[PDB]
Amino acid sequence: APRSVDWREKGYVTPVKNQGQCGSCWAFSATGALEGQMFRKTGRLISLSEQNLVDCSGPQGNEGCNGGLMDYAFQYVQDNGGLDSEESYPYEATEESCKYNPKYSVANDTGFVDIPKQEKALMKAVATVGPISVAIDAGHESFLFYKEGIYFEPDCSSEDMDHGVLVVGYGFESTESDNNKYWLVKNSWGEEWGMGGYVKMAKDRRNHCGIASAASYPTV
Template identity: 65%
Template sequence: RIKGSNGYHDIILQLHHEFVNTLNGFNRSLPGNSAFATEPLRGASFISPANVKLPNSVDWRDKGAVTPVKNQGHCGSCWSFSATGSLEGQHFRKTGFLVSLSEQNLIDCSTKYGNNGCNGGMMDFAFAYIKDNKGLDKEKLYPYRAHDEKCRYNPQNSGATDVGFTDIESGSEDQLMEAVATIGPVSIAIDASQESFQFYKTGVYYEPMCSNETLDHGVLVVGYGTDEDNQDYWIVKNSWGLTWGDDGYIKMARNRDNNCGVATSASYPLV
């Protein structure tokens, strides 16, 4: 057993793989009970903006497009937090209002789209559910429980909706940068299976042992930049509470061969 110093290590952790299996719930090969499991769901393809000079740094938190860091608890629901984060950003950009949206609504109600609640899911499946459902409830009216429950979506409590989603070209950090700069926060999936990720506190996270194909954790890119040592990074919002990482965030290496798969499975909802 390990006792450590940052958030999740205040809990006495058992085995690292147990931590990973409990908390990392992005699953590209869900059994599901819909056609999406055998027929991959496809979003619109991202079209790079023409004649746009991208800023050297972007942080959507400064623009008011990002809700406070949330905590998924011991439930593999990271995919739902990634999805709500991206939709919260798009809804803010469209309306000027930042509304915290319900992960529990996604956990309880999107199983027929291929998601498995606390046992994993995918952000694109969540976006497809929200589109067909014509809404997603507000967090405060459908609060988080960290376990699977009966669906109780109420259209009167809806805080936002989408009309589909866009997929970034797999592996293209250039396209991801364009999307983050011009669209807003973007849902991504990463390999968060390394112990170094679990114990991250500060600095730019680069992990040579990371896979850029075997992805297990859904998170949210809210910006990018370059530090004083000239290291490019992505600003990534996690869903493990404020005590993990750098106040719930991590700076992940950018332009280092898609380290940890940051650009392998990136998408955002259309509003």
């Protein structure tokens, strides 16, 4: 596998969005992976509607602004037979009754695949599939005030995660006596958080913050 991957430079990744005051991270993670897979399929990078997912994927098990699962979001897109564009169905950071319009559907998926809970398996997936939906333990003050560098949190859990994000690549910063490897992770907290909306999560450091424990991607 490549020692460095960054799917943003390959056109797979849309700009950083902002979930606002709503626990819809799962929606932004799922649209991220679907935007990447649709781009691979059609050569078109189109922004997908998280609001469509928040309002409409309740039957699949999601809870709107109270949380959800990326896999349930992929199931909605399969069950629904489509997903509206971000332009047609813009994000409002609130829960509202479903407004899906089949006329504005710009994406489909045929299911999803769950990656084994090993960082090696996640790496090969990022290297060959594209951006990957993952969940991490982001429930700490250091994550909230992260600005730059490789994030490492000693109290992070490898099993208990609360935040759905998107891995768009990986790399390494090399010092004299250490290759400090990282996951390139796209947050949904606006572009003023972290590195323009991005965080470098510690990689190959015992599944730090659970990043390999709930990884999946949609199939198109």
